[PDB]
Homo-oligomer: 167 residues x 10
């Protein structure tokens, strides 16, 4: 069960940090809406999280497009929680407006094809999954360079439009 465009997205149920407390998040929870699943390699890394912040700030634009953004990493929910509790002035992430999923056992990263087995971390993959659970897009960047928030919005708007016309 790897993830491929046109196929059903691998299901998941993962403990996540939502507004500073733990919640069990599954894909089935968002059935009917678009989901944008986006991975990041490590918490507390020496790379500024501008990428997660950009998606956090656009949370509401996604919600208006009928979509929910979810982030995911191979850190525990405790590491990710602490990451949010450590403000940005002090080198952390600060609170955020999107769930952060703790993929400690690596199943998520493996099923979505982004895990770097030797290293224990996910590549910067991003998947857009439609209301019926079909993957309609895959981006995967090496770690050095980030993703564009507007691309995800453009694509979601694109797939909605085509969902409700010919194509």
């Amino acid at each position: 069960m790897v993830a491929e465009v046109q196929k059903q997205a691998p299901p998941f149920k993962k403990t996540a940090v939502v507004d500073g407390i733990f919640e069990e998040i599954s894909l089935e929870k968002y059935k009917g809406k678009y989901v944008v699943l986006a991975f990041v390699p490590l918490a507390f890394s020496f790379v500024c999280p501008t990428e997660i912040v950009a998606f956090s700030d656009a949370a509401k634009k996604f919600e208006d497009q009928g979509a929910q953004v979810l982030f995911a990493s191979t850190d525990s929910e405790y590491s990710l929680l602490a990451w949010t509790n450590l403000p940005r002035k002090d080198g952390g992430l600060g609170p955020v407006k999107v769930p952060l999923l703790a993929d400690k056992n690596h199943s998520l990263s493996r099923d979505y094809g982004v895990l770097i087995e030797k290293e224990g971390i996910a590549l910067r993959g991003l998947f857009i999954i439609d209301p019926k659970g079909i993957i309609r897009h895959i981006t995967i960047n090496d770690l050095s360079v980030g993703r564009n928030v507007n691309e995800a919005l453009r694509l979601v708007e694109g797939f909605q439009w085509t969902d409700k016309n010919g194509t």
Copy 2:
């Protein structure tokens, strides 16, 4: 031999249309340069090729950045040639500033993970490959929605910057 970010890109040698005549194109030919390999499902399809045109028009901007754009489809070099000879006024593609690769035996599309076996055509995948032949990016869109030329430019500039800093 599938394609993965951080791994060596699958090599290939495919007959392509360059400037209305055939040339054998391999990836090894572009070692030292960034390569942006982009697939498209079918020639002569009744869907406007604005996507290939946008990348054709930016061919030279990529070249200036030290990158080569390559397009690829599961059509023969003769179908792709005829596509270029048929102007856009008349429902074709017109000439183009980027090699068009004929993946008739499907090996390319299979090795890069974009082939839809049941259908015989490639998804709209796009791969950025660095000078050492390592895949640094993968985009794959379902057919209904296209790719953004500026994303490929942004990413290439991104990977160059990080290559040197």
Copy 3:
């Protein structure tokens, strides 16, 4: 499930260009009639398509013999359509009086034993299939040399005669 003389022909359902528009063609559609399935790939090749034209021109002679000619290639229905829209003066095929079947996923060419896997194209095979769907003849030519239209007519006439005596 390969094709052999005396055995049931591999069924198929393939999108084809008939009179400049797409139609889904299966073998089951011609049950009761002889079918003459002939392969060619490639479209827009730099070789004059005299072979397809000869069979196009004899379309009606086949129809009189109780047979339907079908052509087939590993090109898409869009490439094949464009081939017909491009007239012969300009290096294309022009319209034709026989369906052109797009075997893009190669299943047809594989099941009929004509695909050159390394290359992605069909050899110049021709199959005559009787009303019950049994293969009664197989021709397969390497690419350099073509088929004779009259052979297919002669064979069909032959198999009809023997169908109704023998």
Copy 4:
């Protein structure tokens, strides 16, 4: 080891009737020449052998084209010999200008894909094999209808022309 256009023809070594006596015939014997190998289901069958006669009569036209015609069946060299010794007025074949190969153990017919296992006889297959031993054509007719001598001549001439241009 089945026979396919573009591939090497299955080698063989079979006892045949040549000019009313037995000789061991192999394909390797005709290397350098075109070979037209043609099968028939049964000797003494109730079908007139006009087909074998037509190819026998054109023997020399084939020889002029640089080709050798060979016939083959699943009968013994003794059955095939007797067939030639029985003249046509009397319901046999009469003498012929082409070797008749006795495929009693069925290996030839199996390797060339014409054997009907349940029945023990070959379909009316015809193979044209070039000087390097590559199969350039395959015809296979059900038993009720025969082959055209001129098709084989046309094809051989065709493949020679294309061999040299």
Copy 5:
């Protein structure tokens, strides 16, 4: 394969009986002894005195409650032509025992007489009783023939023992 004491392999083969084709099976002779004898090849350069000897004794076998059947790996058409070609002219002439065309070799294979590399049957002879059990097997190399009286002696032997 066929073994003494075991059930004989069943068969259904096209044969030449009185110059026309008939489908012969073993099941047809259930209740009688069957003496199945192989020979291939037809038109071979070796005189068929052996088949003639068994043809001439056809009726002695019938009196003993037995049927003789011959078999070869030639087609029914080759075997037919063999009978139509008289002996003056190097053939066999008519015969009073069915000639079975084992073209697909199944019979010869099941009875263990086929020479696979060659496509021909050894000179095997099998005596099969009324219940279909093989009570005797002879197999000669091709160079030397069988004795008709041996088959009669053996059949008489097995009848006697069948009833005491």
Copy 6:
């Protein structure tokens, strides 16, 4: 492994009773001569040995034909010895002019295809083996009915004649 007409006979080396004492008999010992190997179910059986006696009496006729007769059973050389020491008046065999081979471990009977595994005894098989060790004849009778001595003589004479040439 098994014995077939036209093939090399399975070799053997078996302890046998010859003139009231033991000797190790192999087939290799008779190379150059015809050998007629004949099996019998058991010693001391309630069946009169008239069959072995007939072949014993014709020993010398076989020798004149250039042949050696050998008999064989699945009994030990001690059982077979005792069989010969027990005269016929007293229900035994009496002495005989042909070696009697003790196939106790069943290898011979298995290799020659006559063993009845469930029972441990050989069928009444008879094999004629030529000077080069090739099997030229096989007879195998069910137990109820015996073999004919003259058939073996006729066959041996037959195969010699045809051997020469």
Copy 7:
């Protein structure tokens, strides 16, 4: 195979009892101790003092509630003849214990005493209790025999232990 503490392999074998044949199985002696003893060959050049010793003690075994059975790989006809040949004349003479003909070797194989290459049983002796459980195994190479008193001692031993605790 047979093992101490495990159920003895069942059998049904034709045997010589008082000069005639009877079918002996182990199931027949359920409720009694059975002492199954093998011997390599009949008519062997060794006087069978061992079988005689067990024959003479038949009645002491019967008094202990035990039955002695002997077994060999010879036919019932060879074994019968062995008994009919008196000891003065090199045989066995009659005996007071069944003699089992293991011609197909199944018994000797199942009890682990068969010497495959040779076709004979080692001098094994098995004591089997009323429930059919093997309580002892002796197996001697051929050169040296068994002691009758050991079998009696062991049976008495196992009875005693069967009835105390």
Copy 8:
């Protein structure tokens, strides 16, 4: 897997030593006793008193000829941040023993402490001698901690017995 009396599974893992990264292998301590101790998660709601107790006794171990190493399935960045976050503020504060980031789980798998379903290590502790042989294994469920003096006692025990 790791077993008493057998060679310990080798490793080479990025670790936090004095606020910076160093690559730590077992081969680095050949000649000394190594006490390898796992803890399930950084920043967990459970007080690290256990790591602190072993950190405080670092020098007693060093005097005995032993090196203590800690290991978790967190990244070196999570573990670094854990040390930079003082205890007043819910972290670990600095420590006197390397903290090894077993992100790919190989270490925890090879030492038999990984809970596959969960992605975390049990509280295992292994004592490994100078030749790299495992001479002791402790493994505690999550609810209850380890005793520092046991590890010191055992190391002293194995040294004494090493020299007798």
Copy 9:
């Protein structure tokens, strides 16, 4: 094999309890903590001070709701004789804990302490809770022993915070 957090491998083994044989299974102690400890050989030239220490603390374990069990790959007859041979005379003397004879090695194999090549158990100790879950594992090489107080501390620990 036996693992912390998993159900302990069941067993049923003949043991010496107060100089006579009894069949001991784990199921017998369901509801109580069990401390199963292995010892490699009886009559070995090393001191049983370890078994004595646990024997003397038998009652402290019983007060904590726990039963100590010892186990070795010796027969119940060797183990019995070990207890009948007093310590003055180089044996063990009586003891207040069952001694389990794992002659067929199944126990030692299932608990992961058997040294196959040798036929003896390492000095493993397992604490098993009332539901039969393993909550602790110690395994020492043969040269060095276990601490009685550790087992008491751990059991008290797991009772307090139950599960």
Copy 10:
């Protein structure tokens, strides 16, 4: 690798008690002599060792015949040692004139076909092995009943005699 009459005996190398101290005994050590290998289920069992004592007392008669008697059990060399140190008055074995082999890992008992897997003990098997290492006899008694010393002497004398004649 099971033991059978006429076949090579399985080799072994086992720690044994010889005269109250440990020694490594292998079969290879007695090549050239007959060996009489005899098993016993358990030390300190409630059954009197009369059988081992009878063979111990005849040790020297065996030695004079050119044979060595060896005993073997699945107990450790320490259990077997203690067994000898415990005199017979006090329910033990007392010293003995034949090596006692500790088959703790069960390899010996398994290779000679006497191990009762479920139980961990050897049946009362006895094997006579000739100077070339060939098994010339096998006795195996269930546990309830013992073996006869004179049988082993009779058999060894038997096999020697026949070794050195035609008959």
